[PDB]
Amino acid sequence: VKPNYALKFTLAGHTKAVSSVKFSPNGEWLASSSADKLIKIWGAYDGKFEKTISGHKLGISDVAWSSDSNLLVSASDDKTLKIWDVSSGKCLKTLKGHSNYVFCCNFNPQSNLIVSGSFDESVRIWDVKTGKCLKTLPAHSDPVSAVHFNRDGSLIVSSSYDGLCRIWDTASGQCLKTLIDDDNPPVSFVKFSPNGKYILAATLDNTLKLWDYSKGKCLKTYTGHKNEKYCIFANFSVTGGKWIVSGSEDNLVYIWNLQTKEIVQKLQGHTDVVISTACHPTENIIASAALENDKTIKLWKSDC
């Protein structure tokens, strides 16, 4: 079986490259971040522009939702993260400490913590309530491309242009595991599978790999897309068929069968690198976003 994702909405408004799109956990909203220093909120189902959230002094690389869909965190080239009240659009805290661009951020499931990755080669864990840094992990020896909590928040995974994926005990900040192959191409993206047993990792050799966390083994490889330059997000689609979803530097959205590794669909429409894709938490909906020749978000819908 293949999905049949078709274009429903093109979301225009960003004046520079989009960097990241993410659906709210309640499925209501899409949040977008951009080089234009703005966060935009859009209706997930009708594509309707809701509001602009402003305050960062330089471009935003990443945005992430709290579990209750009430807060956003953004990661900025201004070396800060900002926690936002989405309803008011107000900046609640500025997270200060990173010594270079903040690239990537995520809330833990409880949403009492935020994890961030920076070009400063550190991973930081922040208290949402106080806005204070709790820990600095000396995580990598090159820029940190991604950070993610597992399903219960007990673990962090990070990836770096140093070619490593590392798994961290959240409570202690101690490294549990380093995923190395024999080569070490830059790791441009990582996240845990919904059940937290696997890690999906992108490398800048046009390759996605599914890793067994517990064993430290590669189970699956997904190829045929273009990824040698950008930190392109990848997703587990779980609402219909079990797919892998990724953008591509050839301006397409790739969708693979998770088990077979076959490409099942290629979504044509963007006029630049598809940097970010997000899978809706309950509907067969994909959001895709493109760099500065395009600057649009596209919403797609499938019957499976």
Ligand X SMILES: O=C(NCCCCc1nc(CO)c[nH]1)c1ccccc1
Residue 251, Ramachandran bin (φ over 0: left; ψ between -120 and 50: alpha; else beta): left
Q: Which of 36, 62, 121, 249 binds ligand X (CB under 6 A)?
A: 62
Residue 19 as a binder of ligand X (CB under 6 A): the answer is yes
Residues 77 and 123: their CA atoms lie apart, in Å, by: 15
Which residue spans within 79-131 are E strands per DSSP? Answer: 81-85, 90-95, 102-107, 113-118, 123-127
Instruction: Report the sign of the C-alpha dihedral through residues 192, 255, 48, 283, in that order.
Output: negative
Q: How far is the CB of 258 from ligand X (least distance, A)?
A: 20
Residue 231 as a binder of ligand X (CB under 6 A): the answer is yes
Q: How far apart are the first and last CA of the chain?
A: 9
Q: Which of 21, 38, 104, 285 binds ligand X (CB under 6 A)?
A: 104
Contact region with ligand X (CB under 6 A), list: 6-14, 39-47, 127-135, 228-236: 228-236
Query: Other CB atoms closer than 10 Å to residue 151's CB: what's the count?
Result: 13
Contact region with ligand X (CB under 6 A), list: 3-11, 89-97, 205-213, 229-237: 229-237
Residues 77 and 58: their CA atoms lie apart, in Å, by: 5
Which one, 44 or 190, has the nearer CB to ligand X?
A: 190
Which one, 288 or 302, has the nearer CB to ligand X?
A: 288
Q: Which of 233, 243, 256, 300 binds ligand X (CB under 6 A)?
A: 233
Q: How far is the CB of 2 from ligand X (least distance, A)?
A: 27
Q: Give the C-alpha distances (Å, rounded to integers) separating 6 from 9, 249, 295.
A: 10, 20, 19
Structure tokens of 280? 């809706």
Q: How far is the CB of 161 from ligand X (least distance, A)?
A: 8
Residue 189 as a binder of ligand X (CB under 6 A): the answer is yes
Residue 246 as a binder of ligand X (CB under 6 A): the answer is no
Residue 20 as a binder of ligand X (CB under 6 A): the answer is yes
Q: How far is the CB of 275 from ligand X (least distance, A)?
A: 5
Residue 103 as a binder of ligand X (CB under 6 A): the answer is yes
Residue whose tokens read 């993610």: 148
Furthest-apart CA atoms within the chain: distance in Å: 49
Q: At a CB cut-off of 8 Å and minimum separation 6, what does 260 contact? A: none
Q: At a CB cut-off of 8 Å and minimum separation 6, what does 134 contact? A: 113, 125, 126, 127
Residue 200 as a binder of ligand X (CB under 6 A): the answer is no
Q: How far is the CB of 77 from ligand X (least distance, A)?
A: 10
Tell me which residue of 105, 103, 106, 135 sits closest to 119, measured CA to CA.
103
Q: How far is the CB of 273 from ligand X (least distance, A)?
A: 8
DSSP state of 27: S
Q: How far is the CB of 33 from ligand X (least distance, A)?
A: 8
Binding mask 138-157 for ligand X (x = CB under 6 A): -------xx-----------
H/E segment holding residue 25: none
Residue 227 as a binder of ligand X (CB under 6 A): the answer is no
Q: How far is the CB of 156 from ligand X (least distance, A)?
A: 13
Residue 208 as a binder of ligand X (CB under 6 A): the answer is no
Catalog residues that contact ligand X under the rule CB under 6 A.
19-20, 61-62, 103-104, 145-146, 189, 230-231, 233, 275
